[model samples]
Target chain A: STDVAMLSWLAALPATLGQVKDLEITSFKYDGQRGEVRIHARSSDFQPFEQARVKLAEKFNVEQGQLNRSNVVMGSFVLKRQ
Target chain B: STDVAMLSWLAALPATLGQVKDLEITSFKYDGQRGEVRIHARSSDFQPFEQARVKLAEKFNVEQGQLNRSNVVMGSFVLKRQ
Candidate 1:
């Protein structure tokens, strides 16, 4: 059930950004910091990156701050499970 | 003397790319396993990222392997110095 939720959350990005060239969920953990997803992706432009960030945050029900966009190219963000 | 070299090396990217949005040398160290420069940058396209990686490697006299392009959007690479 947890893995299903994680997969669904991860899949939300490509669902939104159809043009995503590469997407990888590097790490997913629910114990330490309220479940963080370290991702690496390549897209033609910035819109997809921004979209994914917002969508992931909304889907995971986490604040924008919990979602770190320091590495925009490689989407690294944390999500809180409710 | 070393600072100039470092600065010069850092400046080489913008000089070549001409449209780099954000460029930051997050870390630079010379004492361990030869010098390494960790960079994060944003550019309009992937060409600039690739160019910078190649240019930095040549300028630093290191192999392409020493330069990593794992994150192309936020140009993160390790450049070894001779």
Candidate 2:
């Protein structure tokens, strides 16, 4: 089984972010085989940005650094299953 | 008067982005003359990232492309006064 996983992260992502004037998850995608997940969020806040990343790690049982933070300035996160 | 300005923008950036999560301006800087302004925001949402950028452009009355979006993976905007 070709279970090679790939993922990407976006910082401060979400859709209602602009509306609620808050940053929240707007989109998420998980690849079946490779076990890859992509999370997106956005907001006008900064502190929560860090918190969200930490939460994802804890919730997903993933390593803190393992979470790729990118697509930034707009909130995005990428996670992979080892 | 010798004035030089430079600005940078970040996407998905804000301080309280992880809890009660919201994306708001985290930081901003402005330089006189070659005027430059930098704004940053973050959120769990995504759309605001785009909206924030547009808002900054409109608020500052600057060109949309003039706002250099960077330090992304978060939220940020840069504006210049002519």
Candidate 3:
């Protein structure tokens, strides 16, 4: 069940960007702290990445934090869930 | 320029998700291999998260791997940049 949930979740990421295309999600890690969810978006989708953070936070009732954007053609976002 | 670029990138992520919110990006780590970038998205944007991942991969000219969805309420996405 975990695998299916995982696969299903993985499959939906691409369309979230709306207009953004050719982006990639490399690796992900989660640390559950005080009912918060943190995420890091690395690569293109610069504009969309930020939107996703806020959207995710609002949807899950999480408090979003600093969205780290790396200049070396990669970036990261950290979202805090409430 | 790097900081500006980073900031610019970070600013854009929030708008990516059309209706999803309250999502958080916990931590991110990048490994360079064959001009590819890896990313991890951990949060509640189960459906939209997957869309964001693919968007980044295609935008960056790289390939995306997996979208790990955790039943524990958090998830992660990994992207590869070309």
**Residue-by-residue lDDT tens digits, candidate 2, B1-82:** 2122222121222221222224444433333333454544444566656665555554354433222344434545555652
In model 1, residue pairs whose N, Cα or C atoms come closer than 3 Å (at least 3 residues apart or on different chains), thus clashing, are none
Q: Model 3, A1-82: lDDT tens per residue?
A: 1122222232233344323443344433333232222334455445655566555544344343444555523555443323
Please state the error at residue A57 of candidate 2 in Å. 1.4
Native contact fraction (fnat) of model 1? 0.00
All candidates in order of DockQ, best leading: 3, 2, 1
- Across all models, the iRMS values in order are 17.7, 15.9, 11.1
Interface RMSD of 2: 15.9
Residue A52 of model 1, lDDT score: 62
Which has the greatest lDDT?
2
Worst 10 residues of 3 chain A by lDDT: A1-10
DockQ of 2: 0.05
* TM-score rank order: 3, 2, 1
Where is model 3 more than 4 Å wrong at Cα?
A1-82, B1-22, B31-36, B61-75
Worst 10 residues of 2 chain A by lDDT: A1-10
TM-score for every candidate vs. truth? 0.29, 0.30, 0.31
lDDT tens readout by residue for model 3, B1-82: 1122222243233344223444444433332222222333444546556566555554444344455555534554443333
- lDDT at position B62, candidate 3: 36
